[PDB]
Amino acid sequence: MASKQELDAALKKAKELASSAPVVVFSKTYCGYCNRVKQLLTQVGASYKVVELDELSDGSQLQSALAHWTGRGTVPNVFIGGKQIGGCDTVVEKHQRNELLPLLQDAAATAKNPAQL
Template identity: 50%
Template sequence: MNNKMAIKEETEKALYKVKQMVSSHPVVMFSKTYCSFCSGMKDLLSELGAAKEVIELDKQSDGAVVQNALLEWTDQRTVPNVFIAGKHVGGCDAMVEKHRKGELFTTLKETGALGTTPAQPTCGETSDTPSKLQPA
C-alpha cells in the first residue's frame, strides 16, 4: 500500500470515529488545550449548562488525522469545532453569533443538550460573551 492510500485509510477511520463521537453526545467540541478561543468556548458552554464532550486534539495520538477528517467532513480544520445534536455548528465565530442572537441556549435546550442544572440566562444576558470572546 502506498503512502497516499495509507493516509486516505487513516482519514476514513478517523472520520468514522468522529461521526461516532458526534452522534453519541449532545455537544461535541474538538479543541486544543492551548487555544484561547477553545477555552472561551468551553467556558461559555459550561456557563450555559451544556452536557459537552471535549476532545483535545493535541492530546490525542491521532489528533492531526482527526483534524484532517474534520476538514474533509465540515470544510473546517480550525478549532474549536462544535457539533450540537449531531449537527455541525462551526467554530468560535458561529457559536458567539448564535449566543449573541440568543439562539445558542435555545438550541441547547431544544436538543436536550443541557445538563441537569443549566444556568438559565437572565433577560439581556444572552448577548454577553465570556471576556475572552469579546470583540476588541
C-alpha cells in the same frame, strides 16, 4: 501511503465522537478560542464533550478528517445534536442572538428544560 483509508477511519472516529454527547468540541490543549467555547457552554449549563486533538492518539489525522468533513479544519469546531454548527465565533454569535439556547434545549444539552424548546 494509506491516508485515504486512515482519513475515512478518522472520519468514522470523528462521527462517533461527534455523536458520543449532545454537544462536542473538537479543540486543542491551549487555544484561547477553545477556552472561550468551554466557558460559553459552561455558563449556559450545557452538558458537552471535548476532544483536545493535540492529546488524542491520532490527533493530526482526526483534525485532517474534520477539515475534509466540514471544510473548517480550524479549532474549536463545535457540534450539537450530532450535527456540525461552526466554531467559536459561530457559537458566541448564536449565544448573543439567543439562538444557541433553543438549539441546546432541543439537543436537551442544557438540563434547564429536558423536553425541548
